[PDB]
Amino acid sequence: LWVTVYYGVPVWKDAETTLFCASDHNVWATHACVPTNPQEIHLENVTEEFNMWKNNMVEQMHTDIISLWDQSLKPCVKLTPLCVTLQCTNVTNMRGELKNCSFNMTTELRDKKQKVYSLFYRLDVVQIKEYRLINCNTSAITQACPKVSFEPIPIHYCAPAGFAILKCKDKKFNGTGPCPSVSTVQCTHGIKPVVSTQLLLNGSLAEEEVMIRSENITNNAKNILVQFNTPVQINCTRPNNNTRKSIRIGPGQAFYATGDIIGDIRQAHCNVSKATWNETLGKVVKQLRKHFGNNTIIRFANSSGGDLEVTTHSFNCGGEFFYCNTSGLFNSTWISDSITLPCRIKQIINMWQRIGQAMYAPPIQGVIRCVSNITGLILTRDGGSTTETFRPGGGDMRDNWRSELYKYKVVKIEPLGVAPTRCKRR
Amino acid sequence: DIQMTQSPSSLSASVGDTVTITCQANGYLNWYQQRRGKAPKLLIYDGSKLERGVPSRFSGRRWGQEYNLTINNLQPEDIATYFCQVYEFVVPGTR
Protein backbone atom coordinates (compact mmCIF):
# COMPACT_ATOMS: atom_id res chain seq x y z
CA LEU A 1 0.00 0.00 0.00
CA TRP A 2 2.32 2.73 1.28
CA VAL A 3 5.41 2.82 3.48
CA THR A 4 5.41 4.82 6.72
CA VAL A 5 8.26 5.63 9.09
CA TYR A 6 8.02 5.14 12.87
CA TYR A 7 10.51 6.77 15.25
CA GLY A 8 10.87 5.19 18.67
CA VAL A 9 9.86 1.54 18.20
CA PRO A 10 11.09 -1.07 20.72
CA VAL A 11 13.88 -2.92 18.89
CA TRP A 12 17.32 -3.99 20.09
CA LYS A 13 20.39 -5.56 18.50
CA ASP A 14 23.45 -7.23 19.97
CA ALA A 15 26.44 -4.91 20.36
CA GLU A 16 29.38 -4.04 22.60
CA THR A 17 30.18 -0.63 24.09
CA THR A 18 31.99 0.98 27.01
CA LEU A 19 30.01 0.84 30.27
CA PHE A 20 30.85 3.33 33.01
CA CYS A 21 30.89 3.01 36.80
CA ALA A 22 28.26 4.17 39.28
CA SER A 23 29.05 3.48 42.94
CA ASP A 24 27.23 4.64 46.07
CA HIS A 25 41.72 6.05 49.58
CA ASN A 26 40.68 2.97 47.62
CA VAL A 27 42.39 0.79 45.03
CA TRP A 28 39.38 0.72 42.69
CA ALA A 29 39.00 4.53 42.62
CA THR A 30 35.28 4.59 43.34
CA HIS A 31 35.55 8.33 43.98
CA ALA A 32 35.71 8.81 40.21
CA CYS A 33 32.63 6.60 39.88
CA VAL A 34 29.47 8.67 39.45
CA PRO A 35 26.85 8.55 42.24
CA THR A 36 24.06 6.00 41.92
CA ASN A 37 16.69 3.64 43.93
CA PRO A 38 17.15 2.16 40.45
CA GLN A 39 14.12 1.15 38.42
CA GLU A 40 13.71 -2.27 36.80
CA ILE A 41 11.11 -2.90 34.10
CA HIS A 42 9.59 -6.33 33.45
CA LEU A 43 9.24 -7.43 29.83
CA GLU A 44 6.51 -9.93 28.98
CA ASN A 45 5.90 -12.20 25.98
CA VAL A 46 9.67 -12.12 25.31
CA THR A 47 12.39 -14.81 25.30
CA GLU A 48 15.95 -13.55 24.77
CA GLU A 49 18.75 -15.95 23.80
CA PHE A 50 21.48 -15.54 26.42
CA ASN A 51 25.10 -16.70 26.42
CA MET A 52 27.52 -16.27 29.32
CA TRP A 53 30.72 -17.71 27.81
CA LYS A 54 30.95 -15.16 24.97
CA ASN A 55 29.86 -11.83 26.49
CA ASN A 56 32.13 -8.78 26.43
CA MET A 57 31.29 -7.49 29.92
CA VAL A 58 33.78 -9.89 31.52
CA GLU A 59 36.68 -8.79 29.29
CA GLN A 60 36.01 -5.10 29.93
CA MET A 61 35.70 -5.71 33.67
CA HIS A 62 39.00 -7.61 33.66
CA THR A 63 40.89 -4.88 31.81
CA ASP A 64 39.29 -2.16 33.95
CA ILE A 65 40.23 -3.91 37.20
CA ILE A 66 43.78 -4.33 35.89
CA SER A 67 43.94 -0.64 34.95
CA LEU A 68 42.66 0.46 38.37
CA TRP A 69 45.23 -1.81 40.03
CA ASP A 70 48.03 -0.32 37.93
CA GLN A 71 47.20 3.38 38.26
CA SER A 72 47.12 3.17 42.08
CA LEU A 73 50.76 2.01 42.31
CA LYS A 74 52.33 5.00 40.52
CA PRO A 75 52.64 7.68 43.25
CA CYS A 76 53.96 5.42 45.99
CA VAL A 77 57.42 4.22 46.92
CA LYS A 78 59.60 2.25 44.49
CA LEU A 79 61.51 -0.33 46.55
CA THR A 80 64.53 -1.11 44.46
CA PRO A 81 67.43 -0.47 46.77
CA LEU A 82 66.26 -3.56 48.70
CA CYS A 83 67.90 -6.00 46.25
CA VAL A 84 71.01 -6.58 48.34
CA THR A 85 72.66 -9.58 50.00
CA LEU A 86 70.60 -10.30 53.11
CA GLN A 87 71.89 -12.19 56.14
CA CYS A 88 69.16 -14.24 57.80
CA THR A 89 68.93 -16.21 61.05
CA ASN A 90 66.14 -18.09 62.81
CA VAL A 91 63.70 -16.03 64.86
CA THR A 92 63.49 -18.46 67.81
CA ASN A 93 65.78 -21.14 69.25
CA MET A 94 56.20 -23.75 62.31
CA ARG A 95 59.94 -23.54 62.96
CA GLY A 96 61.84 -21.82 60.16
CA GLU A 97 58.76 -20.02 58.83
CA LEU A 98 59.94 -16.59 60.03
CA LYS A 99 63.49 -15.29 59.62
CA ASN A 100 65.33 -12.29 61.06
CA CYS A 101 67.25 -10.81 58.11
CA SER A 102 69.68 -7.92 58.45
CA PHE A 103 71.18 -5.87 55.63
CA ASN A 104 72.72 -2.54 54.65
CA MET A 105 70.61 0.32 53.35
CA THR A 106 71.00 3.85 52.04
CA THR A 107 69.86 7.00 53.83
CA GLU A 108 68.79 10.58 53.18
CA LEU A 109 72.42 11.55 52.50
CA ARG A 110 74.07 9.87 49.52
CA ASP A 111 77.47 9.35 51.16
CA LYS A 112 76.08 7.76 54.35
CA LYS A 113 74.67 4.27 54.90
CA GLN A 114 72.87 2.47 57.72
CA LYS A 115 72.44 -1.11 58.93
CA VAL A 116 68.88 -2.34 59.47
CA TYR A 117 66.92 -5.57 59.92
CA SER A 118 63.44 -6.96 59.33
CA LEU A 119 61.40 -10.12 59.87
CA PHE A 120 60.75 -11.90 56.57
CA TYR A 121 58.72 -14.98 55.74
CA ARG A 122 60.33 -18.12 54.37
CA LEU A 123 58.32 -17.78 51.14
CA ASP A 124 59.86 -14.38 50.28
CA VAL A 125 63.59 -15.21 50.44
CA VAL A 126 65.84 -17.43 48.33
CA GLN A 127 69.29 -18.67 49.33
CA ILE A 128 72.20 -17.47 47.21
CA LYS A 129 73.65 -18.06 55.18
CA GLU A 130 73.27 -15.29 52.59
CA TYR A 131 69.77 -14.84 51.16
CA ARG A 132 68.10 -12.48 48.71
CA LEU A 133 64.60 -11.45 47.73
CA ILE A 134 62.76 -14.01 45.64
CA ASN A 135 62.28 -11.83 42.55
CA CYS A 136 65.33 -9.56 42.27
CA ASN A 137 66.25 -11.46 39.09
CA THR A 138 62.81 -11.25 37.44
CA SER A 139 61.03 -8.05 38.49
CA ALA A 140 61.14 -4.79 40.44
CA ILE A 141 59.33 -4.11 43.72
CA THR A 142 56.98 -1.23 44.48
CA GLN A 143 55.47 -0.80 47.93
CA ALA A 144 51.74 -1.25 48.52
CA CYS A 145 51.37 2.30 49.83
CA PRO A 146 49.68 1.92 53.26
CA LYS A 147 47.34 4.91 52.85
CA VAL A 148 44.98 2.83 50.67
CA SER A 149 42.73 -0.08 51.63
CA PHE A 150 42.23 -3.36 49.78
CA GLU A 151 38.67 -4.02 50.98
CA PRO A 152 36.35 -4.54 47.99
CA ILE A 153 33.24 -2.38 47.74
CA PRO A 154 30.32 -2.90 45.31
CA ILE A 155 30.67 -1.50 41.79
CA HIS A 156 27.95 -1.06 39.18
CA TYR A 157 28.47 -1.09 35.40
CA CYS A 158 26.09 1.34 33.70
CA ALA A 159 25.45 1.72 29.92
CA PRO A 160 25.37 4.95 27.86
CA ALA A 161 22.33 6.56 26.27
CA GLY A 162 20.72 4.50 23.53
CA PHE A 163 21.67 1.16 25.12
CA ALA A 164 20.16 -1.16 27.72
CA ILE A 165 21.17 -4.11 29.89
CA LEU A 166 18.95 -7.17 29.69
CA LYS A 167 18.56 -9.47 32.70
CA CYS A 168 17.41 -13.09 33.00
CA LYS A 169 15.08 -13.85 35.92
CA ASP A 170 14.88 -17.61 35.35
CA LYS A 171 15.66 -19.31 38.66
CA LYS A 172 16.75 -22.66 37.19
CA PHE A 173 18.79 -21.16 34.36
CA ASN A 174 21.52 -22.95 32.44
CA GLY A 175 24.61 -21.16 31.16
CA THR A 176 23.38 -20.71 27.58
CA GLY A 177 19.96 -20.67 25.97
CA PRO A 178 16.62 -18.85 25.97
CA CYS A 179 15.36 -17.03 29.06
CA PRO A 180 11.53 -16.94 29.25
CA SER A 181 11.51 -14.15 31.89
CA VAL A 182 13.76 -11.42 30.46
CA SER A 183 13.63 -7.95 32.00
CA THR A 184 15.49 -4.72 31.22
CA VAL A 185 17.59 -2.41 33.37
CA GLN A 186 19.90 0.57 33.11
CA CYS A 187 22.68 -1.27 34.95
CA THR A 188 23.57 -4.12 37.27
CA HIS A 189 23.76 -4.64 41.03
CA GLY A 190 26.83 -4.11 43.19
CA ILE A 191 29.67 -6.49 42.33
CA LYS A 192 32.50 -6.99 44.82
CA PRO A 193 35.92 -7.38 43.12
CA VAL A 194 37.16 -10.25 45.30
CA VAL A 195 40.14 -12.38 44.23
CA SER A 196 40.30 -16.11 44.97
CA THR A 197 41.21 -19.30 43.14
CA GLN A 198 39.44 -22.40 44.47
CA LEU A 199 36.55 -21.17 46.64
CA LEU A 200 34.35 -18.18 45.82
CA LEU A 201 33.87 -15.75 48.71
CA ASN A 202 31.32 -13.00 49.39
CA GLY A 203 29.44 -13.86 46.20
CA SER A 204 25.81 -14.12 45.16
CA LEU A 205 23.87 -17.22 46.18
CA ALA A 206 21.52 -19.28 44.05
CA GLU A 207 17.77 -19.01 44.58
CA GLU A 208 16.49 -22.56 43.96
CA GLU A 209 19.35 -25.05 44.34
CA VAL A 210 22.95 -25.84 43.40
CA MET A 211 23.71 -25.10 39.75
CA ILE A 212 26.35 -26.57 37.43
CA ARG A 213 27.69 -24.55 34.50
CA SER A 214 30.53 -25.35 32.10
CA GLU A 215 31.11 -24.41 28.47
CA ASN A 216 31.14 -28.05 27.33
CA ILE A 217 31.06 -30.70 30.04
CA THR A 218 32.35 -33.47 27.75
CA ASN A 219 35.62 -31.57 27.26
CA ASN A 220 37.72 -32.08 30.39
CA ALA A 221 39.95 -29.06 29.69
CA LYS A 222 37.19 -26.62 30.74
CA ASN A 223 36.41 -25.89 34.38
CA ILE A 224 33.06 -26.51 36.08
CA LEU A 225 31.44 -23.66 38.02
CA VAL A 226 29.31 -24.61 41.04
CA GLN A 227 26.98 -22.19 42.83
CA PHE A 228 25.53 -22.88 46.28
CA ASN A 229 22.00 -22.14 47.47
CA THR A 230 23.23 -21.59 51.06
CA PRO A 231 26.58 -20.17 52.22
CA VAL A 232 29.31 -21.93 54.18
CA GLN A 233 30.77 -19.80 56.95
CA ILE A 234 34.56 -19.81 57.29
CA ASN A 235 36.61 -18.01 59.95
CA CYS A 236 40.24 -17.13 59.19
CA THR A 237 42.71 -15.83 61.76
CA ARG A 238 46.31 -14.62 62.13
CA PRO A 239 47.17 -15.05 65.83
CA ASN A 240 50.50 -13.16 65.72
CA ASN A 241 50.70 -9.67 67.27
CA ASN A 242 53.11 -7.79 64.99
CA THR A 243 54.82 -4.42 65.39
CA ARG A 244 55.55 -2.31 62.31
CA LYS A 245 58.70 -0.16 62.19
CA SER A 246 59.31 2.67 59.72
CA ILE A 247 62.70 3.11 58.03
CA ARG A 248 63.80 6.16 56.03
CA ILE A 249 65.63 5.20 52.83
CA GLY A 250 65.75 8.62 51.16
CA PRO A 251 64.22 12.09 50.93
CA GLY A 252 60.52 11.50 51.55
CA GLN A 253 60.87 7.73 51.06
CA ALA A 254 59.84 5.35 53.84
CA PHE A 255 60.15 1.57 54.19
CA TYR A 256 57.85 -0.21 56.66
CA ALA A 257 59.66 -3.18 58.21
CA THR A 258 58.57 -5.43 61.11
CA GLY A 259 59.94 -4.80 64.59
CA ASP A 260 58.93 -8.01 66.39
CA ILE A 261 56.04 -10.10 67.71
CA ILE A 262 54.51 -9.76 71.19
CA GLY A 263 53.67 -13.02 72.93
CA ASP A 264 53.68 -16.43 71.26
CA ILE A 265 54.16 -17.29 67.60
CA ARG A 266 51.13 -19.25 66.40
CA GLN A 267 49.96 -20.60 63.06
CA ALA A 268 47.37 -18.77 60.98
CA HIS A 269 44.39 -20.93 60.10
CA CYS A 270 40.79 -21.11 58.91
CA ASN A 271 37.81 -22.98 60.36
CA VAL A 272 34.88 -24.57 58.54
CA SER A 273 31.95 -26.48 60.01
CA LYS A 274 31.98 -30.21 59.25
CA ALA A 275 28.25 -30.97 59.10
CA THR A 276 27.35 -28.06 56.82
CA TRP A 277 30.19 -28.98 54.47
CA ASN A 278 28.94 -32.58 54.42
CA GLU A 279 25.44 -31.43 53.43
CA THR A 280 26.85 -29.12 50.76
CA LEU A 281 28.99 -31.91 49.30
CA GLY A 282 25.99 -34.24 49.28
CA LYS A 283 23.94 -31.67 47.37
CA VAL A 284 26.81 -31.09 44.93
CA VAL A 285 27.11 -34.84 44.30
CA LYS A 286 23.35 -35.11 43.74
CA GLN A 287 23.46 -32.32 41.15
CA LEU A 288 26.61 -33.70 39.50
CA ARG A 289 25.01 -37.12 39.06
CA LYS A 290 22.57 -35.59 36.55
CA HIS A 291 25.31 -35.17 33.90
CA PHE A 292 26.50 -38.78 34.18
CA GLY A 293 25.06 -42.19 34.93
CA ASN A 294 22.71 -42.55 37.86
CA ASN A 295 24.92 -45.22 39.50
CA THR A 296 28.36 -43.71 38.81
CA ILE A 297 30.80 -43.18 41.68
CA ILE A 298 31.83 -39.64 42.59
CA ARG A 299 35.18 -38.74 44.12
CA PHE A 300 36.99 -35.67 45.37
CA ALA A 301 40.72 -35.18 45.83
CA ASN A 302 43.55 -32.76 46.59
CA SER A 303 44.83 -30.50 43.83
CA SER A 304 47.06 -32.25 41.31
CA GLY A 305 49.85 -29.67 41.16
CA GLY A 306 51.06 -26.36 39.83
CA ASP A 307 51.96 -23.02 41.37
CA LEU A 308 51.24 -21.96 44.94
CA GLU A 309 48.40 -19.77 43.65
CA VAL A 310 46.33 -22.62 42.17
CA THR A 311 47.11 -25.50 44.57
CA THR A 312 45.95 -23.53 47.63
CA HIS A 313 42.93 -21.39 48.45
CA SER A 314 44.36 -17.88 48.05
CA PHE A 315 42.87 -14.59 49.24
CA ASN A 316 43.57 -11.57 51.43
CA CYS A 317 42.15 -10.79 54.89
CA GLY A 318 42.51 -7.15 55.86
CA GLY A 319 45.74 -6.67 53.90
CA GLU A 320 47.66 -9.93 54.51
CA PHE A 321 47.82 -12.52 51.73
CA PHE A 322 46.70 -16.01 52.80
CA TYR A 323 47.39 -19.29 50.98
CA CYS A 324 45.51 -22.13 52.66
CA ASN A 325 45.90 -25.90 52.31
CA THR A 326 42.45 -27.19 51.34
CA SER A 327 43.18 -30.93 51.02
CA GLY A 328 41.03 -31.63 54.09
CA LEU A 329 37.77 -30.62 52.41
CA PHE A 330 37.86 -32.54 49.10
CA ASN A 331 38.57 -35.76 51.04
CA SER A 332 35.62 -37.99 50.10
CA THR A 333 34.23 -40.73 47.84
CA TRP A 334 30.47 -41.01 47.30
CA ILE A 335 28.47 -44.09 46.26
CA SER A 336 24.75 -44.16 45.48
CA ASP A 337 33.41 -30.51 65.43
CA SER A 338 35.23 -28.39 62.85
CA ILE A 339 37.78 -28.62 60.04
CA THR A 340 40.93 -26.52 60.46
CA LEU A 341 42.89 -25.58 57.33
CA PRO A 342 46.53 -24.58 57.98
CA CYS A 343 47.55 -21.48 56.05
CA ARG A 344 50.68 -19.54 55.11
CA ILE A 345 51.24 -15.83 54.52
CA LYS A 346 53.08 -14.05 51.71
CA GLN A 347 54.06 -10.42 51.13
CA ILE A 348 55.78 -10.20 47.72
CA ILE A 349 52.87 -10.68 45.32
CA ASN A 350 52.84 -11.28 41.56
CA MET A 351 49.25 -10.41 40.68
CA TRP A 352 47.15 -10.81 37.51
CA GLN A 353 49.40 -13.62 36.20
CA ARG A 354 52.04 -11.11 35.07
CA ILE A 355 55.74 -11.93 35.42
CA GLY A 356 57.00 -8.42 34.63
CA GLN A 357 56.20 -6.41 37.75
CA ALA A 358 55.65 -7.30 41.41
CA MET A 359 54.35 -5.64 44.57
CA TYR A 360 55.26 -5.51 48.25
CA ALA A 361 52.81 -5.39 51.16
CA PRO A 362 53.56 -3.56 54.42
CA PRO A 363 53.07 -5.45 57.69
CA ILE A 364 49.81 -4.77 59.51
CA GLN A 365 50.02 -4.56 63.28
CA GLY A 366 47.56 -6.32 65.57
CA VAL A 367 45.62 -9.55 65.27
CA ILE A 368 43.72 -10.10 62.01
CA ARG A 369 40.43 -12.00 61.76
CA CYS A 370 37.89 -12.53 58.97
CA VAL A 371 34.44 -14.11 58.83
CA SER A 372 33.36 -14.88 55.28
CA ASN A 373 30.68 -16.82 53.42
CA ILE A 374 31.76 -19.36 50.78
CA THR A 375 29.26 -19.20 47.90
CA GLY A 376 30.80 -21.25 45.08
CA LEU A 377 33.35 -23.69 43.66
CA ILE A 378 35.60 -24.13 40.62
CA LEU A 379 36.38 -27.73 39.67
CA THR A 380 38.12 -29.80 37.01
CA ARG A 381 37.50 -33.42 36.01
CA ASP A 382 40.19 -36.03 35.39
CA GLY A 383 39.93 -37.42 31.87
CA GLY A 384 40.44 -40.85 30.38
CA SER A 385 37.35 -42.39 31.99
CA THR A 386 32.56 -44.71 35.98
CA THR A 387 34.35 -43.34 39.07
CA GLU A 388 34.59 -39.74 37.89
CA THR A 389 36.91 -37.72 40.13
CA PHE A 390 37.05 -33.94 40.57
CA ARG A 391 39.93 -31.69 41.66
CA PRO A 392 39.86 -28.02 42.72
CA GLY A 393 41.29 -25.55 40.23
CA GLY A 394 41.47 -21.92 39.25
CA GLY A 395 43.98 -19.15 38.60
CA ASP A 396 42.03 -17.25 35.92
CA MET A 397 40.07 -14.25 37.19
CA ARG A 398 37.62 -14.28 34.26
CA ASP A 399 36.06 -17.36 35.86
CA ASN A 400 35.69 -15.31 39.05
CA TRP A 401 34.01 -12.41 37.25
CA ARG A 402 31.84 -14.62 35.01
CA SER A 403 30.02 -16.10 38.03
CA GLU A 404 28.48 -12.65 38.62
CA LEU A 405 27.75 -11.50 35.04
CA TYR A 406 26.09 -14.67 33.74
CA LYS A 407 22.61 -13.08 33.54
CA TYR A 408 23.35 -9.60 32.17
CA LYS A 409 23.83 -8.62 28.54
CA VAL A 410 24.10 -5.36 26.59
CA VAL A 411 21.86 -4.35 23.68
CA LYS A 412 21.65 -1.33 21.36
CA ILE A 413 18.36 0.43 20.62
CA GLU A 414 17.41 1.07 16.97
CA PRO A 415 14.42 3.47 16.93
CA LEU A 416 13.55 3.45 13.23
CA GLY A 417 11.00 1.27 11.49
CA VAL A 418 9.21 1.10 8.15
CA ALA A 419 5.75 -0.42 7.94
CA PRO A 420 2.94 -0.86 5.40
CA THR A 421 -0.08 1.39 5.93
CA ARG A 422 -2.92 2.73 3.77
CA CYS A 423 -2.25 6.41 4.52
CA LYS A 424 -0.95 8.58 1.67
CA ARG A 425 1.03 11.78 2.15
CA ARG A 426 -0.68 14.95 0.94
CA ASP B 1 30.24 -41.49 27.48
CA ILE B 2 32.04 -41.46 24.13
CA GLN B 3 31.89 -44.54 21.88
CA MET B 4 33.76 -44.57 18.58
CA THR B 5 34.77 -47.31 16.15
CA GLN B 6 36.66 -47.67 12.85
CA SER B 7 35.42 -50.79 11.06
CA PRO B 8 37.39 -50.95 7.74
CA SER B 9 40.55 -52.46 9.35
CA SER B 10 42.96 -53.16 6.45
CA LEU B 11 42.28 -52.22 2.82
CA SER B 12 43.75 -53.19 -0.56
CA ALA B 13 43.11 -50.15 -2.78
CA SER B 14 45.24 -49.95 -5.92
CA VAL B 15 47.20 -47.11 -7.49
CA GLY B 16 45.01 -44.58 -9.29
CA ASP B 17 41.78 -45.59 -7.53
CA THR B 18 39.51 -43.92 -4.99
CA VAL B 19 39.59 -45.12 -1.38
CA THR B 20 37.20 -44.49 1.51
CA ILE B 21 37.86 -44.99 5.23
CA THR B 22 34.77 -44.84 7.44
CA CYS B 23 34.18 -44.50 11.18
CA GLN B 24 31.44 -43.71 13.66
CA ALA B 25 31.77 -41.42 16.67
CA ASN B 26 30.10 -38.68 18.69
CA GLY B 27 31.88 -35.37 19.27
CA TYR B 28 34.53 -33.54 17.31
CA LEU B 29 36.59 -35.85 15.10
CA ASN B 30 39.98 -35.37 13.46
CA TRP B 31 41.91 -37.46 10.93
CA TYR B 32 45.65 -38.13 11.12
CA GLN B 33 47.95 -39.94 8.69
CA GLN B 34 51.12 -41.41 10.18
CA ARG B 35 53.95 -42.88 8.14
CA ARG B 36 55.95 -45.74 9.61
CA GLY B 37 58.59 -44.47 12.02
CA LYS B 38 57.46 -40.84 11.97
CA ALA B 39 55.32 -38.32 13.83
CA PRO B 40 51.62 -38.01 12.95
CA LYS B 41 50.30 -35.23 10.73
CA LEU B 42 46.88 -33.58 10.59
CA LEU B 43 45.01 -33.88 7.29
CA ILE B 44 41.43 -32.77 8.04
CA TYR B 45 40.27 -31.04 11.22
CA ASP B 46 36.71 -31.19 12.60
CA GLY B 47 36.31 -34.06 10.11
CA SER B 48 35.19 -31.75 7.29
CA LYS B 49 37.78 -28.95 6.99
CA LEU B 50 41.24 -29.59 5.56
CA GLU B 51 44.31 -27.95 7.07
CA ARG B 52 46.32 -25.59 4.88
CA GLY B 53 49.22 -27.36 3.17
CA VAL B 54 47.55 -30.66 2.20
CA PRO B 55 46.49 -31.36 -1.42
CA SER B 56 42.82 -30.76 -2.22
CA ARG B 57 42.22 -34.40 -3.21
CA PHE B 58 41.84 -35.45 0.44
CA SER B 59 38.22 -34.83 1.39
CA GLY B 60 36.17 -35.94 4.38
CA ARG B 61 32.44 -35.78 4.91
CA ARG B 62 30.11 -36.27 7.87
CA TRP B 63 26.50 -37.47 7.90
CA GLY B 64 24.65 -38.09 11.14
CA GLN B 65 26.94 -40.19 13.34
CA GLU B 66 28.88 -41.65 10.38
CA TYR B 67 32.02 -39.92 9.11
CA ASN B 68 34.33 -40.97 6.34
CA LEU B 69 37.38 -39.74 4.44
CA THR B 70 37.73 -40.24 0.69
CA ILE B 71 40.98 -39.98 -1.26
CA ASN B 72 40.92 -39.74 -5.06
CA ASN B 73 43.76 -40.03 -7.58
CA LEU B 74 45.81 -42.14 -5.19
CA GLN B 75 49.60 -41.80 -5.41
CA PRO B 76 52.25 -44.28 -4.20
CA GLU B 77 53.42 -41.89 -1.47
CA ASP B 78 49.99 -42.03 0.25
CA ILE B 79 50.58 -45.50 1.79
CA ALA B 80 50.41 -44.58 5.48
CA THR B 81 48.18 -45.36 8.47
CA TYR B 82 45.00 -43.29 8.84
CA PHE B 83 43.19 -42.91 12.17
CA CYS B 84 40.53 -40.70 13.77
CA GLN B 85 40.66 -39.26 17.32
CA VAL B 86 37.67 -37.66 19.07
CA TYR B 87 38.97 -35.98 22.24
CA GLU B 88 41.39 -38.35 24.00
CA PHE B 89 40.30 -41.68 22.48
CA VAL B 90 42.15 -43.15 19.50
CA VAL B 91 41.83 -46.40 17.54
CA PRO B 92 44.75 -48.31 15.93
CA GLY B 93 43.59 -47.22 12.49
CA THR B 94 43.72 -48.50 8.93
CA ARG B 95 46.75 -49.43 6.84
Epitope: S303, V310, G384 | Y28, Q85
Partner: nanobody
Framework: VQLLQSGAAVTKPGASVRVSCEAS????????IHWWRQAPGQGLQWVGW????????????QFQGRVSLTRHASWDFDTFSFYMDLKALRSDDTAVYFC????????????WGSGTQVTV
Protein backbone atom coordinates in the same frame (compact mmCIF):
# COMPACT_ATOMS: atom_id res chain seq x y z
CA VAL C 1 56.33 -22.70 15.39
CA GLN C 2 58.78 -25.50 16.18
CA LEU C 3 58.98 -27.97 19.06
CA LEU C 4 61.95 -30.10 20.12
CA GLN C 5 62.62 -33.44 21.76
CA SER C 6 65.31 -35.37 23.64
CA GLY C 7 67.23 -38.47 22.67
CA ALA C 8 66.35 -42.08 23.39
CA ALA C 9 66.69 -43.25 26.99
CA VAL C 10 67.34 -46.72 28.40
CA THR C 11 66.60 -47.24 32.10
CA LYS C 12 66.58 -50.22 34.42
CA PRO C 13 63.30 -51.37 36.00
CA GLY C 14 62.31 -49.49 39.12
CA ALA C 15 63.91 -46.22 37.99
CA SER C 16 62.84 -42.79 36.74
CA VAL C 17 62.95 -41.39 33.19
CA ARG C 18 62.68 -37.75 32.09
CA VAL C 19 61.59 -36.55 28.64
CA SER C 20 61.71 -32.88 27.63
CA CYS C 21 60.15 -30.83 24.83
CA GLU C 22 60.87 -27.20 23.94
CA ALA C 23 58.59 -24.77 22.06
CA SER C 24 60.28 -21.62 20.74
CA UNK C 25 58.25 -20.43 17.77
CA UNK C 26 55.03 -18.82 19.02
CA UNK C 27 53.02 -17.46 21.94
CA UNK C 28 53.52 -20.39 24.29
CA UNK C 29 51.28 -19.22 27.15
CA UNK C 30 48.09 -19.26 25.04
CA UNK C 31 48.06 -22.95 24.02
CA UNK C 32 48.02 -26.19 25.99
CA ILE C 33 50.65 -28.92 25.63
CA HIS C 34 49.58 -32.56 25.51
CA TRP C 35 51.58 -35.78 25.83
CA TRP C 36 50.94 -39.07 24.04
CA ARG C 37 52.61 -42.47 24.05
CA GLN C 38 52.41 -45.24 21.45
CA ALA C 39 53.08 -48.88 22.24
CA PRO C 40 54.83 -50.91 19.51
CA GLY C 41 52.21 -52.09 17.04
CA GLN C 42 49.31 -50.30 18.71
CA GLY C 43 47.33 -47.08 18.58
CA LEU C 44 48.08 -43.87 20.43
CA GLN C 45 47.51 -43.60 24.18
CA TRP C 46 46.56 -40.39 25.97
CA VAL C 47 48.73 -38.77 28.63
CA GLY C 48 47.44 -35.63 30.27
CA TRP C 49 47.88 -31.97 29.37
CA UNK C 50 49.58 -29.12 31.23
CA UNK C 51 48.49 -25.47 31.38
CA UNK C 52 51.53 -23.26 30.63
CA UNK C 53 50.11 -20.24 32.48
CA UNK C 54 49.57 -21.89 35.88
CA UNK C 55 51.21 -25.30 35.50
CA UNK C 56 48.31 -27.42 36.76
CA UNK C 57 48.33 -30.91 35.17
CA UNK C 58 45.52 -33.40 34.50
CA UNK C 59 46.33 -37.11 34.31
CA UNK C 60 44.11 -40.18 33.86
CA UNK C 61 43.53 -42.83 36.48
CA GLN C 62 46.06 -45.22 34.92
CA PHE C 63 48.94 -42.76 35.36
CA GLN C 64 47.86 -41.23 38.67
CA GLY C 65 50.75 -41.11 41.13
CA ARG C 66 53.35 -42.13 38.53
CA VAL C 67 53.68 -39.25 36.02
CA SER C 68 54.53 -35.61 36.70
CA LEU C 69 54.23 -32.73 34.23
CA THR C 70 56.10 -29.46 34.79
CA ARG C 71 57.16 -26.47 32.72
CA HIS C 72 59.92 -23.90 33.22
CA ALA C 73 59.88 -20.60 31.35
CA SER C 74 62.98 -18.51 30.70
CA TRP C 75 63.76 -14.79 30.80
CA ASP C 76 61.51 -12.66 28.53
CA PHE C 77 59.14 -15.66 28.14
CA ASP C 78 60.55 -16.44 24.71
CA THR C 79 61.19 -20.17 25.20
CA PHE C 80 59.54 -22.88 27.28
CA SER C 81 60.65 -26.31 28.44
CA PHE C 82 58.04 -28.99 29.13
CA TYR C 83 59.19 -32.03 31.10
CA MET C 84 57.59 -35.41 31.78
CA ASP C 85 58.70 -37.65 34.65
CA LEU C 86 57.77 -41.31 35.14
CA LYS C 87 58.23 -42.57 38.68
CA ALA C 88 58.38 -46.39 38.50
CA LEU C 89 59.23 -48.03 35.17
CA ARG C 90 57.36 -51.30 34.66
CA SER C 91 57.73 -54.14 32.17
CA ASP C 92 55.22 -52.76 29.65
CA ASP C 93 56.09 -49.06 29.85
CA THR C 94 58.09 -49.24 26.61
CA ALA C 95 56.58 -46.85 24.06
CA VAL C 96 57.30 -43.78 21.93
CA TYR C 97 56.45 -40.42 23.52
CA PHE C 98 55.23 -37.36 21.60
CA CYS C 99 54.36 -33.83 22.68
CA UNK C 100 51.65 -31.97 20.79
CA UNK C 101 50.15 -28.47 20.69
CA UNK C 102 46.36 -28.22 20.91
CA UNK C 103 45.30 -25.30 18.73
CA UNK C 104 41.66 -24.94 19.79
CA UNK C 105 38.61 -26.56 21.38
CA UNK C 106 38.49 -29.06 18.52
CA UNK C 107 41.51 -30.76 20.17
CA UNK C 108 43.40 -30.69 16.86
CA UNK C 109 47.15 -31.17 17.30
CA UNK C 110 48.78 -29.52 14.29
CA UNK C 111 52.37 -29.54 15.62
CA TRP C 112 53.96 -32.71 17.02
CA GLY C 113 57.36 -33.63 18.41
CA SER C 114 60.07 -35.83 16.95
CA GLY C 115 59.46 -38.65 19.42
CA THR C 116 61.52 -40.51 22.01
CA GLN C 117 62.26 -44.22 22.40
CA VAL C 118 61.88 -45.41 26.00
CA THR C 119 62.95 -48.99 26.73
CA VAL C 120 63.37 -50.88 30.00
Amino acid sequence: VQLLQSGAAVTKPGASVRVSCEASGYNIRDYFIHWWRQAPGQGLQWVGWINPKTGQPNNPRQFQGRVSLTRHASWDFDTFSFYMDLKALRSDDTAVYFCARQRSDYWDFDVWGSGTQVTV
